[PDB]
Write a structure and sequence with these properties.
alpha+beta, 5'-(N(7)-methyl 5'-triphosphoguanosine)-[mRNA] diphosphatase activity, binds chloride ion, 4 helices, 3-stranded antiparallel β-sheet, Diphosphoinositol polyphosphate phosphohydrolase 1, binds ligand I7P, 134 residues, binds magnesium ion
Length: 134
Amino acid sequence: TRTYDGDGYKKRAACLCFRSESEEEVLLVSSSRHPDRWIVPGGGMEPEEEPSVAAVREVCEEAGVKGTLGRLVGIFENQERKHRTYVYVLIVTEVLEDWEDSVNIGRKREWFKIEDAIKVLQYHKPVQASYFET
Ligand SMILES: O=P(O)(O)O[C@H]1[C@@H](OP(=O)(O)O)[C@H](OP(=O)(O)O)[C@@H](OP(=O)(O)OP(=O)(O)O)[C@H](OP(=O)(O)O)[C@H]1OP(=O)(O)O
Ligand SMILES: [Cl-]
Ligand SMILES: [Cl-]
Ligand SMILES: [Mg+2]
Ligand SMILES: [Mg+2]
Ligand SMILES: [Mg+2]
């Protein structure tokens, strides 16, 4: 069930899934519709679901990782697609071999240096590139 803010923006949560507390390498996943493109894992908040809980759930489903939830980075809008995403830091401590989206849609995952994550997100996902600005 999709959920919405009072202005009709779809509510989403996502994590920047870092390898370590150094925050030098981040895990991106393939686009579901265009698997040659990379995205930051994330998705819709469920009814009454805390954003931090949604963020951790979506990372598990899409990227097959678990770890230590860190700070809220910020709340980011995509004006064209009308969605508003809470973005958290997650320090990955568990990498699972088989995960929901690998089994169901063959979703891929890959580690990127921050500068390279920004580069591959810029063309189709410039708001997700902007998650790393600070
Ligand atoms: O363009 P499309 O129809 O292929 O899908 C878009 C996006 O559509 P939009 O731009 O109209 O919002 C989906 O949102 P909706 O239309 O379902 O509300 C979104 O689901 P999401 O918010 O993450 O929600 P969850 O399913 O994770 O909860 C999905 O991400 P994937 O999860 O990776 O499939 C995106 O694909 P892409 O980013 O290319 O992978
Ligand atoms: Cl790191
Ligand atoms: Cl976006
Ligand atoms: Mg998603
Ligand atoms: Mg999802
Ligand atoms: Mg979802």
